[PDB]
Amino acid sequence: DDEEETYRLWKIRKTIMQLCHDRGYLVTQDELDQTLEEFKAQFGDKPSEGRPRRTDLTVLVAHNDDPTDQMFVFFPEEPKVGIKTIKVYCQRMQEENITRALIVVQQGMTPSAKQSLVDMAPKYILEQFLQQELLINITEHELVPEHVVMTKEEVTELLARYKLRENQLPRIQAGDPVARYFGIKRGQVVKIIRPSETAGRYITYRLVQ
Template sequence: MDDEAETYKLWRIRKTVMQLCHDRGYLVTQDELDQTLDQFKDQFGDKPSEKRPARSDLIVLVAHNDDPTDQMFVFFPDEPKIGIKTIKTYCQRMQEENIHRAIIVVQAGMTPSA
C-alpha cells in the first residue's frame, strides 16, 4: 500500500477509535473528534513507510467522564499479527500504570496462541 493510502487508513482508524471512546463515555476532545486528514499529517507525519507515523505513535490513553481513574489504552501494534509477547508487553504497561481496560487495533489478527 502506498504512503498516501496507508496514511488515510490510519487517520480513519484513529478517528473511528476516538468516536468509539467518546460514545462510551471517555473524555475525547472535540479537536480529536474533528481532526482532518491534513491535521493528522501535521501531527503524526505522512510517510508510514518511514515510520512517520509509526503505529506505536498513535497509542491513546483516555479517561472516563464519570470516573477519571477509569482509564483505557488504545494500542496500535506495529506487527501485522500479534502474539503472546506483544500482549504481555501491553499487560505489563497497563499494570505499571494501574489501567484495567484496553483496545488493541490489529492489522491482520492474532496468532492462535495469543
Template sequence: MDAATKLFFIRKTLIQMLLDREYLVDATKKEEQLEDFKSRYDGESREVLTLLQRKKSDPSDQIYVFFPDEEKVGVKSLRTYVTKMKESQVSRAIVVVRQGMSPFAKQALAEIQPKYKFEQFTETELLVNITEHQLVPEHVRLTKPEKKALLERYKLKESQLPRMQSSDPVARYYGLERGEVVKITRPSETAGRYVTYRLVS
C-alpha cells in the first residue's frame, strides 16, 4: 500500500471517529474517493491534512486533528500545535503519529495538560476502524443526566458499575474520559439484545 492510499484510509477512520463523537464534518470530506484524495494530496507535507471540526451541540467545543511530518514528533511541532490551538481557542487535539513522540515531547505534553488535551494515535491504529468489526458491540456514551438517571434507577453508586479502562481501544476511539459511563449493546441468542454499562476508569 503506497503512502497516499494509507493516509486516505487513516483519514477516513478519523472522519468517522469525529462523526461518532458528534462533531460536524463536511459531507465532501466524508464522501471523498481515493482518486480525488490522491489528486489533492501532493505527498509532500502531511500538514495539508489538518482538520478543525466543531461539536454539533456546542460550536465552541472544537477539536484539531494534526498530521505531523516527522517520524517521531518533537517539542517544536508540539509548540506549533499549541500556538495554533491558543489562537483558535481550541483545547483539544488528536495527533496522528508515525512512530510516537520523543521523550522531550512527552514531557512537554505532560506539562501542558490538562489545559490542552492531546490524544495520540499511531497510523497503524487508524488504518482500520475497530468499531466496524463484527466482534465490537455498539458503544454509546451517556450524557450526565442519563448517567444520573441510570444510577438512580438501579440504586447504584458510581463505584458499583463494572469498569472500562480509559486506555481501552474503543474508549480511546470515542474519546471517553474517566468518570463517563458507556452503554454497551451486544446481540444475544436468547434475549435478542443484551445491554451492559461500564464506568470509564
C-alpha cells in the first residue's frame, strides 16, 4: 500500500525535526507542526511510484551558535545497506564540507558496513538509526525524565563544588536510547531533572562511559 507509506514518512519526518531541534540546531517553527495533509501536498501524495522517492526527503540544518557546522540526514533506498553506498554519502559529505551526518536505515545494515563506519573516527562522524525507532518520540514518554547536556565549563564546576573526581559519578553507557537521541560521546556529563514527592525536585548527574 501507500497510505500506510505516506503516513510513516510524515511521522518519521516530524520526529527528526524535533531530534535536531533538541541538539540545538535551527528548525523553522511551522516545520515542527507540519500536519499530514500539508506534507501530502508538498512532497507528493504517495511514494509508491510517486514523487517522494525516499530522496527529496533529506534534511540539511545549521547550528544556532554557528552557521558553519551543519548536519545532514540520509534516507537510504535499499532495505539493507552495502559498502560503497555509504561511500556515496561519504563522497557527498566530502564535496559539501559537512561532518555531522545521519542515515535513517530502512530495515538493517551489513556487518561489513558496520566496519566501514567505525574507521573514520577523526572526521565524518555518522549516526546509524533504524526506521522503526524514529516512529515515536521516546523523550515525551511518561517515565523518561528531562535530560540536558552540560558544557565542558559547567562540568568543571561540579567536580570543584562537591570536591569530586569524575570517576565517582553515576554512569550511563552510550548505547541506550537516550544516549543516542542526544548524540553523546564518552567523557560528557548529562543532567537529569526529575520531580519527587519528598522534596519536590531533584537534580542528578550521569557520566557517559
